[PDB]
């Protein structure tokens, strides 16, 4: 018990040695007014707006940097610590430009409040204010930096979370300007977080410039579907259209940060969006028609076609509830070929054992690892808020990162073992140098990005990695709890698909073409009318008209994750629930119901008729979909290896390369993104 | 006196809520999350019970947002999971409790950034 | 068409409204009236812009006409100032 005892205005709390004075007040429950101190950012002491007075002490101390000592009673509401705030707030406000009705961080200001609660009723600054020169930091951040309180949060985030040290302070005196000395845009993922982290409205979001004002925004808590980290987010909706998506804190998944894609592609959600159910008509043009007519177009073809003549290529952002409603429908009919666009090697246990295909070590385990051998992925642009995880654990802890992929910008110092799958065999043999490095690791982890598995020798790549993990485990003598092998995805509806029993890859549809295909939100080119039977009856089930719509005999519009109470699951299996922020547009309907209804018109009606019932259905297919925010551990790995050992495959010499080589690759990757005007502006800025 | 009953206090027949707004409607007990835009934690301390989001459409004449969900602007505020589950069960609504998410303690030190 | 669009598409049934009636539309677009104004030349690096008034104009903000490259524009009046 190394607790040390310290008094918060008397509550006499007991705290670990090394907790800051500000932290001591927090556990009692008091809040020190603070600027320039963020929990996951280094203490800087720039503002000194947190001056408090420990007892019988000569001067005020900075609650952000003073380690509380033994038996110091903090007096947070003394007559002194209020003159130490009534007089600081005098200064921050003195050089501040009064354009609060321009500053769109109007009600979202941590500087008006603290002025309005702890500061002063009046002003004594009868002199002349200063002005700085607005510069361009990008097409996402509007830096009206005459607002800046030189709190250096931005500089730190830019350097400690995102590894992009482009921002910096220039000049001394009151002239200090926090920016980029030469005008180089702040181009990085994790970029938009600066907005959320600058308490002042100096730099704010340019798309959401002046569309709203925060008191009005109704805030619904939902989940990120753009990437497979499944970052928690809050969708701010006003009068029924989404105005902004900002992060909400999840310790394990996104701890207060969200990607540039899943914050500025809410605009893409509002155009090129399907709404009414059109049906090919006349010469072939698609013609808007009522559900009844469009549904029976599909139902009649479904009754005519038998099993294996009906197939579904789902993929992208479809929810688990639609995925079970599409399987239950096609299986009432004989066809059991439900498939996903992202090919996960099934040549072995495949999906049968969940551990096979789930980051086993959780995102939060990256903090406890000792060496990570990323093979096949550019975590940065595939799963950015997991790249950050390895960013923090390489800085605050000591992770030794090794990449077997293309040498790529990773925001940290990795070891480039090489660009060849077969060198995976080199480590398994113990031939390559890093073989000992791992031998030295007590808690190692290996990450294989699905983006590799998508090549032709992906089955061989998974088997080769499983051999090395087994060896690694044996040599490292790693405990059973640590699970060295994990694989991260880049498609939101993959893990759930795989769990619900959907078989990955369109390989099965390739060998026998289906008379009728019900593409379920699939905008990928995995099959085309060109590769289908002459009949080629195909019906798109989705939200945005992109690739599957113009080659579709029927259009059954659906919703998007802002518009339905569906479930998703990230790579670590943690099932999560999107909440309806806005009602779905036009005649468009929830994905699960379209398929329950088509089944009623077809006559093979599905059992559930309300969503709680579909949640009960999910419980039957895979039981850890009905369970939210819980990661389950049963590492059925040992048997996975046995089947891997049976599988014999050749890893071709072609280097394994992540598709998202540089950030322009990243911006536009999905229907809701490829339709983004903001993403498009970002794409041309890079090009 | 002191009669004994053996059931939840179902007051659904005393509330006066039209059936369809007591049957097909899910309350979501949760402690609101912080506005990333600010760092004040005073709006993440009391448990709220908000209802499902139904249609918010457009008034043809002026373009305003219109609605038919009488229980749309409803955000009851409780003080503990226990007292929110009780009210929902009391009124006959379906609930989706979400556990609180207090930040864990993260150790912060000024000197640390000076090491090399 | 209003300064902010709004023009109804010919097919829009929302056009009956104006039958035997008309459309309230302001002819004085502020996008152009403000452009029909002389860039306020100044000597000082920074200048104020009370909105041409004290308490009868807009909150007073100081604009940095520091780069001839850009004429500072008070976010309230849209007045460009030429260093």
């Amino acid at each position: 018990s190394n607790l040390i005892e310290v008094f918060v205005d008397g509550q006499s709390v007991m705290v670990e040695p090394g907790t800051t004075v500000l932290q001591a007040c927090e556990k009692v429950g008091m809040q020190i007014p603070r600027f320039c101190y963020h929990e996951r950012l280094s203490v800087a002491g720039n503002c000194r707006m947190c001056l408090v007075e420990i007892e019988k002490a000569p001067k005020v101390v900075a609650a952000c940097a003073m380690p509380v000592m033994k038996g110091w009673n903090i007096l947070t509401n003394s007559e002194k610590s209020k003159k130490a705030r009534e007089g600081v707030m005098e200064f921050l406000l003195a050089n501040h430009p009064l354009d609060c009705p321009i500053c769109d961080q109007g009600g979202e200001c941590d500087l008006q409040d603290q002025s309005m609660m702890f500061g002063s009723d009046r002003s004594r600054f009868l002199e002349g204010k200063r002005a700085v020169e607005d510069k361009n930091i990008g097409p996402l951040v509007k830096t009206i930096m005459t607002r800046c309180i030189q709190c250096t949060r931005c500089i730190r985030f830019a350097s400690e979370i995102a590894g992009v040290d482009d921002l910096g302070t220039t000049g001394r005196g009151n002239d200090m300007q926090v920016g980029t000395y030469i005008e180089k845009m702040f181009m990085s993922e994790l970029s938009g977080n600066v907005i959320d982290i600058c308490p002042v409205g100096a730099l704010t979001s340019k798309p959401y410039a002046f569309t709203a004002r925060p008191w009005e925004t109704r805030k619904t808590e939902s989940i990120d579907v753009m990437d497979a980290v499944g970052s928690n987010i809050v969708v701010s909706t006003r009068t029924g259209e989404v105005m902004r998506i900002l992060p909400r804190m999840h310790e394990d998944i996104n701890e207060e940060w969200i990607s540039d894609k899943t914050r500025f592609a809410y605009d893409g959600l509002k155009r090129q969006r399907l709404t009414e159910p059109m049906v090919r008509n006349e010469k072939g043009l698609l013609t808007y028609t009522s559900w009844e007519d469009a549904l029976s177009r599909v139902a009649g073809m479904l009754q005519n076609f038998e099993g294996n003549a009906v197939a579904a290529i789902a993929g992208g952002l479809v929810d688990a509830e639609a995925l079970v409603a599409l399987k239950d429908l096609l299986n009432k009919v004989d066809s059991d070929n439900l498939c996903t666009e992202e090919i996960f090697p099934t040549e072995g246990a495949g999906t049968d054992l969940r551990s096979n295909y789930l980051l086993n070590t959780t995102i939060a385990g990256v903090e406890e690892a000792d060496v990570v051998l990323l093979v096949g992925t550019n975590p940065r642009f595939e799963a950015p808020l997991f790249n950050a995880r390895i960013r923090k654990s390489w800085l605050h802890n000591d992770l030794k990162v090794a990449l077997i992929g293309s040498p790529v910008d990773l925001t940290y110092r990795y070891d480039h073992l090489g660009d060849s799958p077969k060198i995976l065999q080199d480590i398994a043999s113990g031939r390559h140098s890093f073989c000992e490095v791992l031998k030295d690791a007590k808690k190692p982890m290996v990450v294989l990005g699905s983006s590799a598995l998508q090549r032709d020798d992906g089955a061989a790549i998974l088997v080769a990695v499983s051999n090395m993990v087994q060896k690694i485990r044996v040599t490292t003598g790693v405990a059973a709890e640590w699970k060295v092998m994990n694989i991260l995805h880049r498609i939101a509806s993959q893990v759930a698909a795989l769990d619900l029993g959907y078989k990955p890859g369109v390989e099965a549809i390739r060998k026998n073409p289906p008379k009728m295909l019900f593409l379920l939100g699939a905008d990928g080119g995995c099959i085309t009318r060109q590769d289908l039977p002459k009949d080629c009856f195909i019906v798109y089930q989705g939200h945005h008209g992109d690739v599957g719509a113009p080659m579709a005999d029927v259009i059954l519009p659906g919703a998007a994750y802002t518009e339905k109470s569906a479930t998703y699951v990230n790579t670590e299996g943690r099932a999560q629930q999107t909440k309806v922020a806005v009602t779905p547009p036009g005649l468009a309907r929830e994905d699960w119901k379209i398929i329950r209804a088509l089944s009623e018109i077809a006559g093979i009606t599905l059992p559930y008729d309300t969503l709680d019932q579909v949640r009960n259905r999910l419980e039957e297919v895979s039981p850890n979909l009905v369970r939210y925010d819980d990661i389950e551990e049963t590492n059925y790995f040992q048997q996975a290896s046995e089947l891997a050992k049976l599988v014999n495959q050749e890893v071709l010499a072609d280097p394994l390369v992540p598709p998202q080589l540089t950030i322009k690759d990243f911006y536009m990757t999905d229907s809701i993104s490829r339709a983004s005007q903001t993403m498009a502006k970002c794409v041309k800025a890079v090009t | 006196q002191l009669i004994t009953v053996d059931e939840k206090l179902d007051i659904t027949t005393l509330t006066g809520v039209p059936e369809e707004h007591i049957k097909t409607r899910k309350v979501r007990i949760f402690v609101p999350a912080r506005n990333n835009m600010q760092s004040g934690v005073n709006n993440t301390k009391k448990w709220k019970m908000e209802f499902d989001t139904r249609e918010r459409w457009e008034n043809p004449l002026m373009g305003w947002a219109s609605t038919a969900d009488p229980l749309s602007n409803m955000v009851l505020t409780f003080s503990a999971k226990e007292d929110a589950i009780a009210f929902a069960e009391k009124n006959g609504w379906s609930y989706d409790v979400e556990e609180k998410k207090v930040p864990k303690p993260k150790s912060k030190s000024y000197g640390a950034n000076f090491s090399w | 068409i209003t300064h902010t669009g709004q023009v109804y598409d010919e097919k829009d049934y929302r056009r009956v409204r104006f039958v035997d009636r008309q459309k309230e539309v302001n002819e004085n677009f502020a996008i152009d009236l403000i452009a029909q104004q002389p860039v306020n030349e100044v000597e000082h690096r920074i200048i104020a812009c009370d909105g041409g008034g004290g308490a009868l104009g807009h909150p007073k903000v100081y604009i940095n006409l520091d780069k001839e490259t850009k004429t500072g524009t008070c976010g309230y009046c849209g007045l460009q100032f030429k260093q």
Binding site: E241, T275, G284, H544, G586 | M62 | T4, R21
Partner: peptide, 27 residues
């Protein structure tokens, strides 16, 4: 120091949504 000019309201909003326009020629 009966009239036709009657105020009529709008939705001065720029329509806030965009539907996919189907492909012009068939496949």
């Amino acid at each position: 120091p009966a009239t036709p000019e009657q105020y009529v309201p709008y939705s001065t909003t720029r329509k806030k949504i965009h539907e996919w326009v189907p492909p012009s020629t068939p496949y």
